[PDB]
């Protein structure tokens, strides 16, 4: 199928507590496979998925050098941002970055990503055409004019169209089924009486991968959207995910309700009942 590779950088200034902290995590699809933390005892990129542990020490050494240079770059960006917003050196601030590439089953680029947030809000992002910028405010427009005059979007375009796609292609090769195969949810319905005339039907999906999924409750074939309680999809901690949807039903009418489950690992959606 289609695949993506993404890096997620977080830099956090700590006024009067040292230099800013830099953390990175790397993902293929929904599978985290590397990390770096500047606050570790000997900061070094480290494996987090089984298929990447095969890489030789030159891989980890090279990437460690890059993260350290990135962390120093972010420090300077944070100092500029503080000036753009007339903030004090005494305030802690956050710079987040995410970039990477989506490819189709043919392996060639489908979409590139390259974006930033400052203190939790959108700041500037590269547009899908990989040639123009969307700035969130007037401060981000200082950055936008800088990057246009230097024609740096052409550089970004080349990394996303080139090297990004080649690393993804190689990581998909190492991973084999651990990255290609979708794991369908294990599903069931539980039943929790509230009182006379009311009980909760909870529809569960467990152990699924990737994280995208849809759970809906229907009454006699018609959606119950404004009355269904959903929880956010949550990690199980073994690289699979969980979700549930619940609805309150008139007691004795439990068998009017169906739960529908859509997921990449299910050719046909599932229809579930309490019975």
């Amino acid at each position: 199928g289609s695949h993506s590779m993404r890096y997620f950088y977080t830099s956090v200034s700590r006024p009067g507590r040292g230099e800013p902290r830099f953390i990175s995590v790397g993902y293929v699809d929904d599978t985290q496979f590397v990390r770096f933390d500047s606050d570790a005892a000997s900061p070094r990129e480290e494996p987090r998925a089984p298929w990447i542990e095969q890489e030789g020490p030159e891989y980890w050494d090279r990437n460690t050098q890059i993260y350290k240079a990135q962390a120093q770059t972010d420090r300077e960006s944070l100092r500029n941002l503080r000036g753009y917003y007339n903030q004090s050196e005494a305030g802690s601030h956050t710079l987040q970055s995410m970039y990477g590439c989506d490819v189709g089953p043919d392996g060639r680029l489908l979409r590139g990503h390259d974006q930033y947030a400052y203190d939790g809000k959108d700041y500037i992002a590269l547009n899908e055409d990989l040639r123009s910028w969307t700035a969130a405010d007037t401060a981000a427009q200082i950055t936008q004019r800088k990057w246009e005059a230097a024609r740096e979007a052409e550089q970004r375009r080349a990394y996303l169209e080139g090297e990004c796609v080649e690393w993804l292609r190689r990581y998909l090769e190492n991973g084999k089924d651990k990255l290609e195969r979708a794991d369908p949810p294990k599903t069931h319905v539980t039943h929790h009486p509230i009182s006379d005339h009311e009980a909760t039907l909870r529809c569960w999906a467990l152990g699924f991968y990737p994280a995208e999924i849809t759970l809906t409750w229907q009454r006699d074939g018609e959606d119950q959207t404004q009355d269904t309680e959903l929880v956010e999809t949550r990690p199980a901690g073994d690289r699979t995910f969980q979700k549930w949807a619940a609805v309150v039903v008139p007691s004795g009418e439990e068998q009017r309700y169906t739960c529908h489950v859509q997921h990449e690992g299910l050719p046909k959606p599932l229809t579930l009942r309490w019975e």
Partner: peptide
């Protein structure tokens, strides 16, 4: 692998 080009905001 992480990219090795760097950009100041």
């Amino acid at each position: 692998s992480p990219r090795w080009y760097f950009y100041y905001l």
